[PDB]
Amino acid sequence: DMYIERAGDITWEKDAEVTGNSPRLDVALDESGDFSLVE
Amino acid sequence: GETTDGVYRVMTRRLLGSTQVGVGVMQEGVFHTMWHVTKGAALRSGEGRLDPYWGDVKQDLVSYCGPWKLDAAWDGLSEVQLLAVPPGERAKNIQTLPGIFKTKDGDIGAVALDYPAGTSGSPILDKCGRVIGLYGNGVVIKNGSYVSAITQGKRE
Ligand SMILES: Nc1ccnc2c(Cl)cccc12
């Protein structure tokens, strides 16, 4: 039996920890909603 | 129960301790999450019960109490913030520029941020604070690092 607890507001927070790259990827989506790397 | 707009942890007691299995957004009285988090199962919010209303395993999405409410899209240019909510840890905005899932059916935003699976459902924001999709469905690349789609539902 799952339950939910609030974890915060949905807001854009100016000066947040800016990280991560921006890769372009060829992918296939199956009927099970699993993504996979098409190479 | 709590029906206040905002982001939420999805918890189970069916394992050891209380375990965060995912995250979701309450908006306009509707709770939005990823299908793989709840498997369409019902949810508790106080005594309050949430019942599934819409769901699609292929989109890996599901809404409770009403139809999918979130129609905002990545504009293809601007940066965005994963409002990540990890297990046992406080909500925390991470700003990033999305990459791209190129698929036979089209291009999807993707965010290269690595977080425990319990973060699945954490929302992704545009600069006006609108939710443009949910993190936690995607792919592992060469490195061993996780890349997630910006998964958005269709609103009516
Ligand atoms: N291996 C994984 C499967 C599914 N989801 C994940 C998320 Cl959200 C983060 C990191 C790893 C994974």
Resolution in angstrom units:
2.1
CB atoms within 10 A of CB B100: 18
Structure-solving method: X-ray
Question: Does the annotation mark B145 as catalytic?
Answer: no
* Last residue of one domain, picked from the residues B64, B89, B111: B64
Among candidates B55, B33, B35, which has minimal Cα distance to B45? B33
Residue B37 lies in a domain: yes
Host domain of residue B26: 6-64
Residue B75 domain-assigned (yes or no)? no
B119 lines ligand 1 (CB under 6 A): yes
For residue A30 the two structure tokens come to 């199956």
Give catalytic status of residue B120 as yes or no: yes
Instruction: Among B120, B135, B150, B151, name the best residue to mutate to test ligand 1's pocket (greatest count of ligand atoms within 8 A of Cβ).
Output: B120
Q: Is A39 on the interface with B (CB under 8 A)?
A: no
User: How many independent structural domains does chain B possess?
Assistant: 2
Is B41 in Cβ contact with A10 (below 8 Å)? no
Q: Which amino acid is at B150?
A: I
Q: In terms of Cα–Cα distance, which of B53, B65, B51 is closest to B4?
A: B65
The sign one gets for the Cα dihedral B89, B115, B81, B38 is negative
- We report the CATH number of the domain holding residue B30 as 2.40.10.120
- Say how many CA atoms lie within 13 Å of B4 toward its Cβ: 12
